[PDB]
């Protein structure tokens, strides 16, 4: 028993992390086969970040301007290529520690593990959700840029995220491994609006199921509700609309606990309307939305 | 910026995790050099756990009764030895992936990373504190027993914890790697009292410093206080007494933020007495005590 926010084991990803240096700039890169992936703003000084013409900036750079190191092992670069907001540095040496891997673009509400690095050196690991407004609430310092988010499906590492920017807000923005930003964000040091940060309703419900599985059943009410009635309450509290697909995804958890989804929705309704009255659920005084149904079942079953 | 509960990278520990089977019982073991460490209750059936005579139970077992596997690689056992509550299974093959390592007994209030396994297979990683009552709030299922807690000091993995028991309470108990339980607990399926679960005051303060470093400064009050006056309030709310050593440990954080320890203590006093009034600190509606000063500085500096 017990329920913790839990990252995937990071070993497979640790052996892929390298230091990418270009001029004065140094950050973290991802070394897979004979290609190193990194934020394209590695070519930028601090002054360039205000209004960068990446194409023009990149043209001053040749292969030899990129120092790629993998812990005292300086790789050699034999070809470079900008793909959207990522640089792809071809190298002579293929990473012998390359895991089975995929590149995937993740959806809002889905979770992933972040291996936070500094200048190519793994520092630690934590679990994140891609929030509805396509930000994450991470922990990244100078050097962390190029730190990656991933999921592990049995043997395959699925890379979904690379960290690029910290907003003036403090929250974090990044790309998939093809270099496309999650959200409207750009790799430019300017004012950038993250939208309203809504809550992932299906996750909150998954978490409430986890709490019941773990013996916290106090919230369970004597009411029920419909989707419409629930969603009218959801919209009020900047919660995501709950759809039928959401209900279906929660079915296994419903089947395990013997609690229908709408019954659990009614519990959530009252919690939202009436608060927690100073009580806690799974050792939290807030409604938590960074656990997917998959995460709950993964941690509960095996 | 940003502040997250963060585990150490687990790669070094992943390559040490093995499956230990004895009769019907299977759990996780730690393979270091030519020795495998595991909970001694691996020799127990469910019936034995009620009132085990470990010495008598172990005598029925010979070397060949222990099946040690490291992912399709069945190790061979050439000597066995019970050390307190751990079994030490000597084997022919030395782990080639043995990291630089130490065994350390950790103190109450100190943190560590748990690599949660099932039957020798790493499942995930999260950060824990050894609580004042020598329990942890983990996540362990059947198979997780023998999962280990560790810290990484640059090159050296320092193993501090092995998971053995879940209490009827739900909270978790275990040993150091020499097999001595943290706390009064025994490896017997019986009713076992964990004491009053007090809060780690120096950690809470470390966390409050982290919050100020990250821009949450709302709690900061116009008062100050003494240690005695503070500790009289601390005792009331089952907080650990704050000592002078605690003050000294917080000095760097005090020096960074320009906020004296006692000034921060007065903030904490009011929070304890007046609550949070529905506000949050670092995205939490509770006072968090599982971040040491080291953890805060590690994550803030680099």
Q: What is the DSSP string of B31-53?
A: EETTEEEEEGGGG--TTGGGS--
CA dist B232 and B222 (Å) reads: 20
- Give B239→chain A minimum CA distance, Å: 17
Of B5, B172, B284, the CB nearest to A126: B5
Nearest to A115 among B9, B166, B214 (CB): B9
B140 and chain A in contact, CB less than 8 A: yes
- What is the resolution of the experimental data for this entry, in Å? 2.1
- Taking CA atoms, B82 is separated from A182, B86, B180, B228, in Å, by 54, 6, 12, 47
- What would the CATH number be for the domain defined by B201-301? 1.10.1840.10
How does DSSP classify residue B7? B
Deposited experimental method: X-ray
C-alpha A60/C-alpha A43 separation (Å) is: 9
DSSP chain A: ------BPP-HHHHTTEEEEEETTEEEEEEEETTEEEEEGGGG--TTGGGS--HHHHHHT--GGGEEEESSS-EE-EEEEEEETTEEEEEESS--TTPPSEEE-PPPTT-EEEEEEEETTEEEEEEEEE--TTS-B-----TT-TT-EEEEEETTEEEEEEEEEEE-TTS-EEEE-TTSPBSSS--SSSS--------B-HHHHHHHHHHHHHTT--TT--S----HHHHHHHHHHTTBPPP-HHHHHHTHHHHHHHT--HHHHHHHHHHHHHH--TT--BTTBSS------HHHHHHHHH-
The CA R_g of chain A, rounded to the nearest whole Å, is 22
Largest CA distance in chain B: 69
**C-alpha distances in angstroms, A174 versus A41, A49, A225, B144, B178?**
12, 15, 38, 35, 45
Cα(B224)–Cα(B262) distance, rounded to whole angstroms?
6
Q: How far apart are CA B41 and CA B186, in angstroms?
A: 11
- Measured CA to CA, the distance from residue A146 to residue A38 in angstroms comes to 5
Phi, psi (deg, nearest 5) at residue A234: -60, -50
Instruction: Specify the 3-state DSSP secondary structure of B82.
Output: strand
- d(CA B41, CA B52) in angstroms, rounded, equals 9
Which has the closest alpha carbon to A145: A165, A125, A121, A169? A165
What's the CA gap between B51 and B190, in Å, rounded? Answer: 8
B121 touches chain A (CB under 8 A): no
A16: left (phi over 0), alpha (psi -120 to 50) or beta: alpha
Options B16, B38, B41, B246, the catalytic residue: B41
**What CA–CA distance (Å, rounded) separates A19 from A121?**
8
Tokens of A269: 């309704």
Distance from CA of B147 to the nearest CA of A (A): 13
In angstroms, rounded to a whole number, what is the distance separating the alpha carbons of residues B65 and A288?
Answer: 46
Chain B residues with CB-CB distance to A2 below 8 A: 137-140, 166, 170-172
Tokens of B50: 């009620």
Q: Strand, helix or coil at B20?
A: strand
Which residue do the tokens 């050097």 mark? A143
- The C-alpha torsion from A98 through A103 and A104 to A106, rounded to 10°, is 70
- Determine contact: B18 vs chain A, CB below 8 A: no
Q: How far is B7 from chain A (nearest CA, A)?
A: 5
Number of residues that make up chain B: 302
Give the span between the Cα atoms of B260 and B241, in whole angstroms: 18
Nearest Cα residue in chain B from A283:
B286
How would you label A221-231 residue by residue, b for 16+ Cβ within 10 Å and e otherwise?
beebbebeebb
Residue B106 gets which letter from DSSP? Answer: P
CATH class of A11-91: mainly beta
Q: Please give the DSSP secondary-structure letter assigned to residue B194.
A: -
Catalytic option among A85, A117, A145, A160: A145
d(CA B183, CA B167): 12
Instruction: Give the gap in angstroms from C-alpha A266 to the nearest C-alpha of chain B.
Output: 23
Contact present, B144 and B116 (Cβ < 8 Å):
yes
B239 close contact with A: CB closer than 8 A:
no
Beta-carbon separation of A137 and B215 below 8 A: no
Q: In terms of CA atoms, which chain A residue is nearest residue B154?
A: A123
Query: Is A64 designated active site?
Result: no
In contact, B288 and B111? CB cutoff 8 Å: no
Could you give the CA distance from residue B266 to residue A247 in angstroms, rounded to a whole number?
47
CA angle A66, A70, A71 (to 5 degrees): 125
Residue A145: active-site member: yes
């Amino acid at each position: 028993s017990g329920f913790r926010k839990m990252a995937f084991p990071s070993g497979k990803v640790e052996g892929c992390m390298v230091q990418v240096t270009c001029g004065t700039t140094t950050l973290t890169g991802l070394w897979l086969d004979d290609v190193v992936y990194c934020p394209r703003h590695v070519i930028c000084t601090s002054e360039d970040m205000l209004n960068p013409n990446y194409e023009d900036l990149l043209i001053r750079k040749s292969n030899h301007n990129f120092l790629v190191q993998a812990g005292n092992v300086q790789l050699r670069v034999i070809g470079h290529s900008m793909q959207n907001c990522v640089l792809k540095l071809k190298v002579d040496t293929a990473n012998p520690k390359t895991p089975k891997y995929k590149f995937v673009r993740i959806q809002p509400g889905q979770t992933f593990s972040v291996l936070a690095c500094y200048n190519g050196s793994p520092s630690g690991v934590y679990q994140c959700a891609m929030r509805p407004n396509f930000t994450i609430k991470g922990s990244f310092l100078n050097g962390s840029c190029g730190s990656v988010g991933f999921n592990i499906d049995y043997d395959c590492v699925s890379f979904c995220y690379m960290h690029h920017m910290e907003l003036p807000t403090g929250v974090h923005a990044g790309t998939d491994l093809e270099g496309n930003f999650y959200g409207p964000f750009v790799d430019r040091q300017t004012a950038q609006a993250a939208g309203t940060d809504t809550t992932i309703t299906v996750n909150v419900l998954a978490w409430l199921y986890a709490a019941v599985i773990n013996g916290d059943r106090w919230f369970l009410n004597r009411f029920t509700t419909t989707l419409n009635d629930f969603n009218l309450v959801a919209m009020k509290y900047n919660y995501e609309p709950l759809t039928q697909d959401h209900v279906d995804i929660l079915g296994p958890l419903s089947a395990q606990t013997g609690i229908a989804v709408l019954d659990m929705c009614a519990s959530l309704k009252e919690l939202l309307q009436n608060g927690m009255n100073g009580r806690t659920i799974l050792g939290s005084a807030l409604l938590e939305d960074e656990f997917t149904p998959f995460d709950v079942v993964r941690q509960c079953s095996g």
